[PDB]
C-alpha cells in the first residue's frame, strides 16, 4: 500500500532576520522509500543541502530530514519541492515562519 509524504518546512532555531540558522524540510509518512526532495531559494534549487539517512516510524512509514545552513532575510523566499510515486506532480510547500 502506497502512502503520500507529509511535508513540513521550518527553521532549526526560531527565525531571526540576519541570524545564521538551518532550514529544514521534514518529509514523513511515506511508502515506498524512494523520494525526491529539493530545497528552493526564490524558486531555485539550493546546492549545499544535507539529509539524514533512511529511517522509519512506528507506523512503518519512512522519514527523511533535509537541511541547509542559511541566514533568513526579509526578501528571501524558501520552499521544499517533493516528488514521490503517490504524487502526479511535485508538491511545493513554502517556508511559513508561523508554522
Amino acid at each position: 500500500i502506497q502512502r503520500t509524504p507529509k511535508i513540513q518546512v521550518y527553521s532549526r532555531h526560531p527565525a531571526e532576520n540576519g541570524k545564521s540558522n538551518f532550514l529544514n524540510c521534514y518529509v514523513s509518512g511515506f511508502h515506498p522509500s524512494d523520494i525526491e526532495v529539493d530545497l528552493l531559494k526564490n524558486g531555485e534549487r539550493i546546492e549545499k543541502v544535507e539529509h539524514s539517512d533512511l529511517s522509519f516510524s512506528k507506523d512503518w512509514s519512512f522519514y527523511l530530514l533535509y537541511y541547509t545552513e542559511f541566514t533568513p532575510t526579509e526578501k528571501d523566499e524558501y520552499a521544499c519541492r517533493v516528488n514521490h510515486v503517490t504524487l502526479s506532480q511535485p508538491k511545493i510547500v513554502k517556508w511559513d515562519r508561523d508554522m
Binding site: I1, R3, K6, Q8, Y10, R12, H13, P14, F22, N24, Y26, S28, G29, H31, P32, S33, D53, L54, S55, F56, K58, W60, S61, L65, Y67, D98, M99
Partner: protein, 276 residues
C-alpha cells in the same frame, strides 16, 4: 525514568539488476546510537554513538557479523514473501521489522517487542507473552507454523528478556550524559488574525527531548479537543524536537484560552496565555 531500546530494520529488493538494500538502525528512546547499511562505503556511513565507539572492535565486528548474517535471512524472507503473495521477481518489495525492550527506572524488564511488516502492512508480531505469534494476514499463518516448528519465539524471547535488557542498561550508563537527560521545551504563544471575527492562537514547543509531549488548548479550564489542530512532532536536526497546537478563537476572547504543556523534562507542567 523508563527507557526503550529498538532496532528498526529494512530489507528492500530493487528494480532490474539492482542489489537489495539492508539497513538496521538502533535507538535508545529517541537517540539513534548505531546504523548498519549495505549502501555504506566506509565506517562514516555506519555512524555510531561515542559510547559505542568506546566498545571497540570486538563489539563492532560482532555486530557487523550479525547484521551480515541477518541480511542472508532477509534475502530468503523476501523470496518467500513474493511466493506467498504470487508476485513477480521483477518487483521491488520491502520487509521491515521493529524489535527490542522496555525497562522501568530500576532497569527491570517491562515489555518485549518483535514485529514485521511487508510492503508497509503489518505481517506478523510476537504477542506480549513473548510465547506466541499474532498473524495480521492470511499468509502469515505459513510463517507462524515454520516459526512454531523452529521454536523461534523461545529464541526471540531469550534475546528480549536477556541480551536486550542487559545491553540497554549498559548503554544507559555509558551514554548517561545524553540518554538520561531530559530537555524541557522552550515555549511561546503566537496570535494570527484570520478575519474580523476570529484569530488563531498557536502554542509552540521547541528544543525538547524526548519526542513525547502533550500540548492542549483550554477554554475557561475546559479542554478544546475537537477544535485543536496539532502538527506532527518534528526533529530540529540537533537531537531536539518541535511541535505546536493551534485553536481558532473569537476576536476579544483570547484571555479565555490557556495552553497546557506536559513534558518529562518539565519539573511542573506549564499553563500559557497569549501575552501581547
Amino acid at each position: 525514568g523508563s527507557h526503550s531500546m529498538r532496532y528498526f530494520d529494512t530489507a528492500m529488493s530493487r528494480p532490474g539488476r539492482g542489489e537489495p538494500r539492508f539497513i538496521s538502525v538502533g535507538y535508545v528512546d529517541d537517540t539513534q546510537f548505531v546504523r548498519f547499511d549495505s549502501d555504506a562505503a566506509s565506517p562514516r556511513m555506519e555512524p555510531r554513538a561515542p559510547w559505542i565507539e568506546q566498545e571497540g572492535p570486538e563489539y563492532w565486528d560482532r555486530n557487523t557479523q550479525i547484521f551480515k548474517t541477518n541480511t542472508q535471512t532477509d534475502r530468503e524472507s523476501l523470496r518467500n514473501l513474493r511466493g506467498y503473495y504470487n508476485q513477480s521477481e521483477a518487483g521491488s518489495h520491502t520487509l521491515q521489522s521493529m524489535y527490542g525492550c522496555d525497562v522501568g527506572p530500576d532497569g527491570r524488564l517491562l515489555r518485549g517487542h518483535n514485529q514485521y511488516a511487508y510492503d508497509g502492512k503489518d505481517y506478523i508480531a510476537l504477542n506480549e507473552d513473548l510465547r506466541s505469534w499474532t498473524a495480521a494476514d492470511t499468509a502469515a499463518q505459513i510463517t507462524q507454523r515454520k516459526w512454531e516448528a523452529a521454536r523461534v519465539a523461545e529464541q526471540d524471547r531469550a534475546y528480549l528478556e536477556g541480551t536486550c535488557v542487559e545491553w540497554l542498561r549498559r548503554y544507559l550508563e555509558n551514554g548517561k550524559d545524553t540518554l538520561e537527560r531530559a530537555d524541557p521545551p522552550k515555549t511561546h504563544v503566537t496570535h494570527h488574525p484570520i478575519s474580523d471575527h476570529e484569530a488563531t492562537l498557536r502554542c509552540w514547543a521547541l528544543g525538547f527531548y524526548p519526542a513525547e509531549i502533550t500540548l492542549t488548548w483550554q477554554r475557561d479550564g475546559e479542554d478544546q479537543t475537537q477544535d485543536t489542530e496539532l502538527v506532527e512532532t518534528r526533529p530540529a536536526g540537533d537531537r531536539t524536537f518541535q511541535k505546536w497546537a493551534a485553536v481558532v478563537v473569537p476576536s476579544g476572547e483570547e484571555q479565555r484560552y490557556t495552553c497546557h504543556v506536559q513534558h518529562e523534562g518539565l519539573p511542573k507542567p506549564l499553563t500559557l496565555r497569549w501575552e501581547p
